[PDB]
Structures are given as structure tokens and as C-alpha cells.
Amino acid sequence: SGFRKMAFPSGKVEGCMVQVTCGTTTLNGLWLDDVVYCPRHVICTSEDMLNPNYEDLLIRKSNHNFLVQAGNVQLRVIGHSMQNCVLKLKVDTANPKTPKYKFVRIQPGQTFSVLACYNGSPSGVYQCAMRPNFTIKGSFRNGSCGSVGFNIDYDCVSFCYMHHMELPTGVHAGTDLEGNFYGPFVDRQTAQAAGTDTTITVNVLAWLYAAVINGDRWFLNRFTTTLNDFNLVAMKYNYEPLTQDHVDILGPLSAQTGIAVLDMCASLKELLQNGMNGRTILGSALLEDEFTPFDVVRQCSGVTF
Amino acid sequence: SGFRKMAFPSGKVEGCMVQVTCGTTTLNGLWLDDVVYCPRHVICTSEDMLNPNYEDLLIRKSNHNFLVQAGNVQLRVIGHSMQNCVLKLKVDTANPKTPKYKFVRIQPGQTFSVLACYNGSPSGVYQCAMRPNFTIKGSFRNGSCGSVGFNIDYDCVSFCYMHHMELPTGVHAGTDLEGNFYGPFVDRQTAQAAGTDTTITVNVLAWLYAAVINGDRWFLNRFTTTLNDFNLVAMKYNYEPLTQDHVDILGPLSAQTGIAVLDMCASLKELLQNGMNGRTILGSALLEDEFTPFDVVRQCSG
Numbered sequence A: 001s002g003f004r005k006m007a008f009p010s011g012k013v014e015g016c017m018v019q020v021t022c023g024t025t026t027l028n029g030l031w032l033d034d035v036v037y038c039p040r041h042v043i044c045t046s047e048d049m050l051n052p053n054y055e056d057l058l059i060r061k062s063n064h065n066f067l068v069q070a071g072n073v074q075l076r077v078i079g080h081s082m083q084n085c086v087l088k089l090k091v092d093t094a095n096p097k098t099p100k101y102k103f104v105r106i107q108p109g110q111t112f113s114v115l116a117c118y119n120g121s122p123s124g125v126y127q128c129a130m131r132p133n134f135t136i137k138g139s140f141r142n143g144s145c146g147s148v149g150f151n152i153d154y155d156c157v158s159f160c161y162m163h164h165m166e167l168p169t170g171v172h173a174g175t176d177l178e179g180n181f182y183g184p185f186v187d188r189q190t191a192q193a194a195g196t197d198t199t200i201t202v203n204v205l206a207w208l209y210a211a212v213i214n215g216d217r218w219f220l221n222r223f224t225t226t227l228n229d230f231n232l233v234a235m236k237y238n239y240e241p242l243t244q245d246h247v248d249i250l251g252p253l254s255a256q257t258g259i260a261v262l263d264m265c266a267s268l269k270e271l272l273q274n275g276m277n278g279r280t281i282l283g284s285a286l287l288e289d290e291f292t293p294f295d296v297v298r299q300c301s302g303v304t305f
Numbered sequence B: 001s002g003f004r005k006m007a008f009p010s011g012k013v014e015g016c017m018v019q020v021t022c023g024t025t026t027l028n029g030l031w032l033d034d035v036v037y038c039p040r041h042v043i044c045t046s047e048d049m050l051n052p053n054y055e056d057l058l059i060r061k062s063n064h065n066f067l068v069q070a071g072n073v074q075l076r077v078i079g080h081s082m083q084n085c086v087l088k089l090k091v092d093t094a095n096p097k098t099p100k101y102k103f104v105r106i107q108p109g110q111t112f113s114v115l116a117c118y119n120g121s122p123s124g125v126y127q128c129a130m131r132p133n134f135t136i137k138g139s140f141r142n143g144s145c146g147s148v149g150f151n152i153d154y155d156c157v158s159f160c161y162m163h164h165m166e167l168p169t170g171v172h173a174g175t176d177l178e179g180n181f182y183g184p185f186v187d188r189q190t191a192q193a194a195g196t197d198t199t200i201t202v203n204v205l206a207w208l209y210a211a212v213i214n215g216d217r218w219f220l221n222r223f224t225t226t227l228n229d230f231n232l233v234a235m236k237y238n239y240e241p242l243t244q245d246h247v248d249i250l251g252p253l254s255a256q257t258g259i260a261v262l263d264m265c266a267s268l269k270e271l272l273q274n275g276m277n278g279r280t281i282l283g284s285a286l287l288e289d290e291f292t293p294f295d296v297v298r299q300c301s302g
């Protein structure tokens, strides 16, 4: 038993982390087969990042201006191309540690493991949730750009995040592996503001199902609701509206407990209107929203990869 | 910036995880060189686990009785010994992915990364702290025995925990890699309670320093207390006493933020007597004690 914030085993990703350097600007890159993926601002100087023209800056760069290092071993760059905010560097060596992988763009509220890296060497791993305002409440310092976020499904690593910047509020923003930023952020050295964040309702409901599975079910009421009525009420409490996919991925937890999804929504609605009344759920007085229904199922079922 | 519960990269340990089966009992094993380390209760049956005479049960087992599998491959057991609660199975093949390693016994309050595994396959990784009552608050289910805890320094993996048991209260207990249990627990199928769980005081203070570094200051006050006066109140709330060693270890955090330790102690004292009301610290509604001063410095130095 027990419920902890669990990251995926990071071994398959550790073997793909390299260092990328242009002049004196250095960050992390992702080495899959014979291609290294990294943030495009590696080609910028400190002053270039203030107001960069990436098309102009890249046209002056040649393959021999890129230093890619797996540890201390250099991988010669034999080709380069820009795709949105990510630089793709073809190298002379196919990574023998390349796992089965996919490039995926995740939804807000979906979780993933972040392998924090500095100078191409992994330093730590932890689980993040993509906030509804497309930020992540991570832990990133200088030199962490290029660190990737990922999920593992069986033998396949689904890469979903690459780190680019830290907002003034201390949260973090980045792109998918195709270089498309999550949310309305740009890769420039400017103070950028994120939208008003909200609570991930599908994850709170999954956490409620996890409590019911563990015998903590005092919050179950005799009410039900429609999905539209609940979505309108939830927004008044700064909670995210539920999608059809949200109801679908809550299916297994609903079947395992016998509690209909819309019944759990009405129970959560009462918890928002009247509070907890000095009671706790799973030992916590706060409603946790960084556990997806997959995270609840994966943890309680001992799923391996 | 930012502060999060983070674990070491587990790749060096994933290459050592194997599956050990004896009879109808299956758990995880740690494959280092030509030795596989796993909990010794894998040799027990349902009736044995009640009151197992391990010396008597082990002598009655042969090499062929143990099925060790590393991924697809089956490792041939060519020898078997036992050190306390850890069974040692010698195999005819050395693990090529064996990293630089060492077996260490950590102290209460220190942290380590847990690679939770099932049937020899890694499932997840998270950070745990060795609580003062020598239990850990982890997430282990059936088949997780043999999962190990560790710390990594440079290229060396320092193994410090192997999982054995979940107490009725939901917390977990295990041994070091020499088979010695952390706490007064025994590897038998009985309901066992631990001593009173106190709070790691030096860790709460470091966590409060991390909150100040990250812009959380609402809990601070203008007051200062003495070391003894704080420990009097701390022990009243089942907090571990704060030693001058702990005060010195918090030094870099105190100098970086400009808040003296004794100043932070006065803030913690107010939090214990008045509570947190409805506010939170670093997103938590409770006083966290599973972050060491090193965990805070290593994450908030810049």
C-alpha cells in the first residue's frame, strides 16, 4: 500500500542525454539514433537571446560550429536543421542505447517524469504535471535547458517535454519534441506571464477514486450530476472542465469501485461547496491534483516496464 | 528555481534488478557481479513464514531450487549463503552492468532513492527518508520485496535499503544490504508496530529555508529563540531535538537567506503552537521533514 509521487525509471532516457555547445552557450540534448534534439537558442549568445532572429542566426552556423558530447566523447555533427524551437543535429554515430520511442504532445493535467540534466549528465528525476496554464511546477536551474520529460509505456519511451525557460513566478515552460511550445510562451530572454492556473479536476477525481479503493470513502454522497452542469459549477471554483477523454480514462477506476463518474463528480462538487469540514482524504486536507487516473491505476496495480 | 522531491537517476540500479523465484514465492533480487542479493523469506512457504527457522530452512535447500531470471535469461545458481535477512545466491555469470557500488547503513533522517520493482522489472523511482522510528513512508505492493534504496555519489552507487515488509499502519520496513533490519522488526508474517514516529527537525528547518529561497515568507517572524528553549517546545510536539551539529549543517542555508538558524527555529516554534491555519508552504499543508539540508543546498544553491 501507500501512495507516492512516482517517476518512471529513467535508465532508457539517461543513455540518450548529451551535451550541446555553440561557442560558450551550452545545454542538454537528446540523442536518439543518429539525431540530437536540443533547444534552438543554443546558437545564441547571451545578448542574442534578448531579441533573436533564429533564421538569421542559424544561417551563419555550419555543422562544424556545433559541439555534441556524450560525456567527454565528441559526436561529429554532419547536418543541422531547425523545426520550430528545437534544433535537430544529425551526428556521425547512431546511439546504441536508443530505446523504442515516440514523440507525443501531452494534454494539460497529464503527468510525466522529468530527468533533470546539467552539462549532459542526469542529476535527478521527478514527476511533473502539465498545469492547465501550460506551465510546470518543476525544479530547474542554469544549464538545465534541453532536459526532457517523458512517460514510459512497456518498452516505449514517449517523449513529451523539453525545457526552455523559467517564468518570473518560478514556474517553468517548454516545448514538445517537435519544438512547439506548450502555451503562449516564446524562447526569448524576456519576462513572460502565464495565464491564471486552475485545479486539474480529472486528477482530483482520480485521487478520490484512489481514496475509495483504500477504504476512505466518507465523501461519497447520494447525489449525481450531468457533465455540463458539473463543468459549469467547477469553473466557478477555478477547476478545469472535464472532457470526454477525461470521463473515458476515469472508466477503469469507476468500474473498480462501482462508483459512476458522474456520481464522483457530484461528491467532488459538494467538497467544493461545503469544504472538508475538518476532515482529511488519504491523510491530506488538500485535494491533490497531480495524480492522473493512469498514475492511480499504475501505482495500485504495480505496472512495470 | 523551484523545489521538488527528487530521486537519483536509477539507470545504474535498473541494470542490477533480477527476479528470484523459490517454490511458489517470487520477489526481486539485486545482481552485483556474480552474486544475487534478495530477501531470505523467498525460501519460505505459507506455513514457514509464520515462525520461520531460517537456518533450518536454508540448509534444506539446493542450488537448483532457486530460479533466477535476468530479463529473458536464466542465471544458474552455483552457490547460496545467507547474511542475516539477506539471501545471497552466487551465479555462474557476472553482471556486466555492475556499477561501482558500496553497502552502507544510513542514519535516521537521511534520505535515499527507492527503485520500486515487481517480478525483477523496475516500476518507479521516488525519494524516501529513514524516519527516526526506522520505518519509511513508501509505496510498496505485493511482489515489491527485494526492491532496493540507494544514493549515488559521482559514479558510485551506495546501497542502503532492501524492502521486506509493510506494517499494519501502512508504513514500510526493511534491512540494509547486510541483512540487518532498520528498527525492531523481524521478517516473519506477523502484525508489528513501530516506536512513536517523531519528526526530523533539522529537515523541517531546511525545508523552511527552501521555501524562503523560493519566495515563501509568510511564516517568518521577528523573534529569536535559544537552542534549549526551542528543543523544549520541539520535544513537546514529538520533534527530534536539534543539536549544534544540525545548526552547523544548516549554515550555508542560513548565510544564503540571511536568516539565522535560531531565527528559523522561532518561526518553526510559532508554526507548532499556532498551526498553519489554512495556508500552505511550498504547496504542502503539513510541515515536511523528508528533505535533508544537503537536498536543499544541492537544489537551491544558485
Ligand SMILES: *[C@@](O)(CO)[C@H](C[C@@H]1CCNC1=O)NC(=O)[C@H](CC(C)C)NC(=O)c1cc2c(OC)cccc2[nH]1
Pocket: A026, A027, A041, A049, A140, A141, A142, A143, A144, A145, A146, A164, A165, A166, A167, A168, A172, A186, A187, A188, A189, A190, A191, A192, B001
Ligand atoms: C536554459 O538552461 C538556458 O539554456 C535556461 C533554463 C532557466 C534558467 C534557470 N532556471 C531555468 O529553468 N533557460 C533560459 O535561461 C531562458 C533563455 C532562452 C532564451 C529561453 N530564459 C529564461 O528562462 C528567463 C528569462 C527571463 C527574463 O529576461 C529578462 C526576465 C524574467 C524571467 C526570465 N526567465
Ligand SMILES: *[C@@](O)(CO)[C@H](C[C@@H]1CCNC1=O)NC(=O)[C@H](CC(C)C)NC(=O)c1cc2c(OC)cccc2[nH]1
Pocket: A001, B026, B027, B041, B049, B140, B141, B142, B143, B144, B145, B164, B165, B166, B167, B168, B172, B186, B187, B188, B189, B190, B191, B192
Ligand atoms: C514482499 O513483497 C513479499 O516477498 C512483501 C512486501 C509487502 C507486501 C504489501 N506491501 C509490502 O510492502 N513482504 C511481506 O509480505 C512480508 C512477508 C515477509 C515474510 C516479512 N509480510 C508483511 O509485510 C506483513 C505481514 C503482516 C501480518 O501477518 C499476519 C499482519 C498485519 C500486517 C503484515 N504485513
Ligand code: NA
Pocket: none
Ligand atoms: Na478569465
Ligand code: NA
Pocket: A215
Ligand atoms: Na476498516
Ligand code: NA
Pocket: A232
Ligand atoms: Na447555473
Ligand code: NA
Pocket: A236, A237
Ligand atoms: Na467560489
Ligand code: NA
Pocket: none
Ligand atoms: Na480548454
Ligand code: NA
Pocket: A255, A256, A257, A258
Ligand atoms: Na466493483
Ligand code: NA
Pocket: none
Ligand atoms: Na558443487
Ligand code: NA
Pocket: none
Ligand atoms: Na564448491
